[PDB]
Amino acid sequence: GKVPETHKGYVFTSGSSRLTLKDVPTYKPGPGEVLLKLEASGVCHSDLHILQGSFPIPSNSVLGHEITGTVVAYGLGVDPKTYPEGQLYAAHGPNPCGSCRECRSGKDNLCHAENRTNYGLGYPGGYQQYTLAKVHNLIKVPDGVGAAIAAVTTDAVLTPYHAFKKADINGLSKILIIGLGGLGINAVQIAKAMGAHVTAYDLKESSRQLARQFGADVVLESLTLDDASKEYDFVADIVSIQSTFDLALKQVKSNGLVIPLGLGSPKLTFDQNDLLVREIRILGSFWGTSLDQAEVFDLVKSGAFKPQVETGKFKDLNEILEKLEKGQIKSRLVLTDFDDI
Template sequence: MRGAVFWEPNKPLTMEDFQMPRPKAGELLIKTKACGVCHSDLHVLKGDLPFSSPCVLGHELTGEVVEHGAHTDVSVTKRFPIGSHVVGAFIMPCGNCFFCVKGQEDLCEAFFSYNRAKGTLYDGETRLFLRNSGKPVYMYSMGGLAEYCVIPANALAKLPNSLPYSESAILGCAVFTAYGAMRHAADIRAGDSIAVIGVGGVGGSCIQIARAFGAAEIIAVDVLDEKLSNALGLGATHTVNASKEDVVDRIK
């Protein structure tokens, strides 16, 4: 297979040939259909966020299940049969650590100890190796900027066949983040009034989710009129341009 490899900061990615990655128990091999570029990927590319190299970036991913790892539990194979459309989450929870058991998968100890610190999955090994040399290549999350990737089943969700791959790739990152903010941090309920500061990918998703939760007033705050106009289309009831007026006074 082919994948885009990051070697060092501020250098172009290169397309390389890889051995076909093999999933292990509890993991699935996914044929990548779409993968976005997140700002955290750009932080790695610029050297602002240190990460093991060489590596494959990309975690805003949708794809199709093509293989189950040997000895994968039957509950997983039934949930994600071959051919299933799926979306991956950028945090890939182990499901077993202190935080995962508490339902705080975003703080998964294994994810940060292994994937973010070492570029591997939870056995301490990558699933990516260059075809000719066998050199290991590390994984930023699942390493989605490749034709295939290995993802733990805990980090996957079924994607309805009616949803397009490209537009849905953002679900596992910006929308995933926005849902956590709206449900678990802000605890938005029907009738609430909220202000969303900054309406990029995450902020725009916050607006849509708040609307789905029944928020009565959704105030979008940004410094660009174009983004504020877009926010109205996403469900904002009011907008405030912070470069032109006092945000606190206007919201009051």
């Protein structure tokens, strides 16, 4: 059908707690690009850190970085035959240039080439009715994967997956996972699938119930900095606020590994005496690469990864974001029904 000249888009402005729905000129696809009519857009906590200030990005942007849609317009170099009408596609969040040094080494999650940015961090995001995508950054969603699970596997599944491959854990590893939410429950599933013994914490009774439901060999209901160390091979702190980071660096093994996978706090402090004497390793992990994306989609098709999404109204995004901050969402949430504006 006909692509419109203007669509509705949630615009962020540096200084406002809420997103403003506005009228955006629908983008015309550049060379090597297409226009996606959004089918499902995942809501992510990082967007609350943006709206709150703790992760600053350019103003006057459309947020949203968990993107799934169909191609409805084609730029130069894209042959319409290559990308058929009706086919569901998922976008590679980081939106890599695909030809720079970070990209060509793998590590295209870390692209910082100057003619693009990460989705929902400047480049027009998922909280709108249409957005651009470079063809190189689109993956065909395998039949049987719903649009909503497909959206959230680009970040809620992808990110802990990339981090856990960093962790090089296996059936003899014993790992700890702090914070069990959108990423967290996927984190449990993928650690369990890699084979590791898993223990999981999260304040929400619902989220611990999901983790016990998902194979977490131990779902703890408490965790104080006087519960002596169980010397895990690997701690994934997926909230990463000073409270949980302190807990993690006490609970990890000598010469162990801690990944602060969350953006709970823009600064973070560690005991240096201990870090040094026990040769602790803290590793940054950011999103995941496009190879990682191909792999996780394979595993979601295989039923190994079974993401836990819920649908919601596009028009309700702001309200939905409110309930995310108060933590009244079971696992992740995804906007659908974009034509209800």
